Amino acid sequence: ADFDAVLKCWGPVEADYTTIGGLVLTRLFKEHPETQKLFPKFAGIAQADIAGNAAVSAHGATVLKKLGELLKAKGSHAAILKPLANSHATKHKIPINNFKLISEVLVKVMQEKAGLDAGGQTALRNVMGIIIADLEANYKELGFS
Template identity: 65%
Template sequence: MADFDKVLKCWAVVEADPDAIGGEVLNCLFMEYPDTQKQFPKFAAIPPAELAGNAAVRKHGGVVVRKLGELLKAKGDHTLILKPLATTHANIHKISLNNFKMFKEALVKVFAAKGLLDADGQAALRNVMDVIIADIDGFYKELGFQG
């Protein structure tokens, strides 16, 4: 619970411009882990130099961080939020668990670079994301998805 609270302390900044921050996180994900860009069909053909300013990347990044905000505010009681997300990511998008781990690292990197979280907050964000990812893994197993 304490880790969720540490991360939520910076969330007002994220909510002030979720598209910008979410876009930065996706851009970081694509730069750090280029193969992840292929998981997003509508972004797959965008040249790396054009990702940072791309409106569609920003918009989708906003969707992602808004959903993450819902998960964080649930403070671990997130089954009703997470199970449908895991189901679509398994059955429709075919997103491996490793992609969520790479997303976590991109998220931490951006939050650190923006000064949103100090080292303790970054550790808390990793811990929270590990809980979420473990729960996604559980849902994946229920679905028989080997992601």
């Protein structure tokens, strides 16, 4: 049910993955500035210059398309999520807690841009908790606790 509640509001996201992707990453780097250092291509860009950055928005679109592709899997997602855990633990070297940060930014952006109501915001938090727990279990399989 929580996947359905999110998907019932995904239309505005999927309609403009680049604009919404840029909003998410711009907000993440504003509200959680330590996360920006984890993107060496973007680290050190002054905040004022992030909202207009086409590379930032294109990367945000990649992230949101992947999360769409996870959402629409409704928890049957191993072939999608194992590779993401592998790359994020071993290539990008992202500590797990940062996933909670981007998830909360997404809840805010969807509240403001996608019609996600207070129950919907619960639902997305729950779904992101599923995804993050799976990422974390795969991190541990790789030796990253």
